[PDB]
Amino acid sequence: NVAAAERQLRELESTFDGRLGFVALDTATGARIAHRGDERFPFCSTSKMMLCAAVLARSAGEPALLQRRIAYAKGDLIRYSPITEQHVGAGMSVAELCAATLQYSDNTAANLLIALLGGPQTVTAYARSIGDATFRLDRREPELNTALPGDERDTTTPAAMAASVHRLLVGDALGAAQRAQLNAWMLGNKTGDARIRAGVPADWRVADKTGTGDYGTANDIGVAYPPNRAPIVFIVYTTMRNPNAQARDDVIASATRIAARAFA
Numbered sequence: 001n002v003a004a005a006e007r008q009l010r011e012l013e014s015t016f017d018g019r020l021g022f023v024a025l026d027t028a029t030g031a032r033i034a035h036r037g038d039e040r041f042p043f044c045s046t047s048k049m050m051l052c053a054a055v056l057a058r059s060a061g062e063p064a065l066l067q068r069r070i071a072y073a074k075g076d077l078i079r080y081s082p083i084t085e086q087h088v089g090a091g092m093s094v095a096e097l098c099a100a101t102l103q104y105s106d107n108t109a110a111n112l113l114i115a116l117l118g119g120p121q122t123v124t125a126y127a128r129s130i131g132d133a134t135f136r137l138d139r140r141e142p143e144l145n146t147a148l149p150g151d152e153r154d155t156t157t158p159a160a161m162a163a164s165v166h167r168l169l170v171g172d173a174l175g176a177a178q179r180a181q182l183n184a185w186m187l188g189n190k191t192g193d194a195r196i197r198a199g200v201p202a203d204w205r206v207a208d209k210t211g212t213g214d215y216g217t218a219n220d221i222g223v224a225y226p227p228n229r230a231p232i233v234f235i236v237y238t239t240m241r242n243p244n245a246q247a248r249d250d251v252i253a254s255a256t257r258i259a260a261r262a263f264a
């Protein structure tokens with residue numbers, strides 16, 4: 001019951017002093033549950049999905065690109081870089097940097113990949129090329145996570161991100177090999193156990209990318225793969241009014257459960 005689910009999302013939002021942006025889409029029927037679907041939210045590290053999709057797209061035209069070694073420096077290292085800091089001095093391949101940024105939310109890896117592509121504007125241009133007129137990447141890590149009230153930098157809408165996740169992981173925005181690699185990376189994410197993954201039935205597989213930012217911002221985007229039915233896209237953006245808010249996992253899990261029940 002889409003209308004019942006949307007009411008429950010409104011009730012969930014009433015429990016905290018912030019905003020919930022949500023879209024769930026059953027890709028077979030197009031059944032769609034949304035809350036604040038056309039409002040902008042700070043996407044934080046969920047942008048790393050669009051970044052790596054852009055890298056994969058480049059690799060379709062440069063066969064050796066994913067195996068190229070990037071010999072980055074200690075001076076490139078910034079906070080929340082659990083893979084790149086361990087391997088500095090040996091370097092990492094482009095594929096390994098994508099895996100790190102997607103599965104561990106590695107910030108240095110994202111900056112290296114942004115630089116490889118030519119800057120944050122190339123990620124925005126990639127989004128436009130797949131039909132997303134809304135996503136905008138304005139800054140690099142870590143400043144893209146400031147999540148300031150009313151700031152449109154480094155934002156998208158839940159609706160635009162739902163369409164982009166659909167086209168990238170389920171549809172044909174990427175070639176088959178690139179779609180499979182993006183899925184494989186996101187299926188292996190390590191940072192989302194308490195978010196979308198905590199709100200779905202035990203037999204659903206999940207490909208997701210989380211984000212956490214200032215103003216208690218807590219996001220998760222991805223696709224659930226139930227057995228014997230089509231994939232379901234889940235987009236969850238949350239951001240709080242208190243600059244001193246502590247980011248939570250439980251609102252995302254609760255919003256996910258609402259939609260999972262509706263799509264039972």
Ligand SMILES: *[B@@]1([O])OC2=C(C([O])=O)[C]=[C][C]=C2[C][C]1[N]C(=O)[C][C]1[C][C][C]([N][C][C][N])[C][C]1
Pocket residue numbers: 044045046079080105107142145191209210211212213214
């Ligand atoms: B990013 O948004 O992804 C990310 C997550 C995530 O995937 O949920 C968790 C932890 C770090 C990161 C890196 C990216 N975010 C930031 O760099 C901003 C940073 C995240 C940690 C917060 N810590 C507050 C005090 N416990 C503050 C902002």
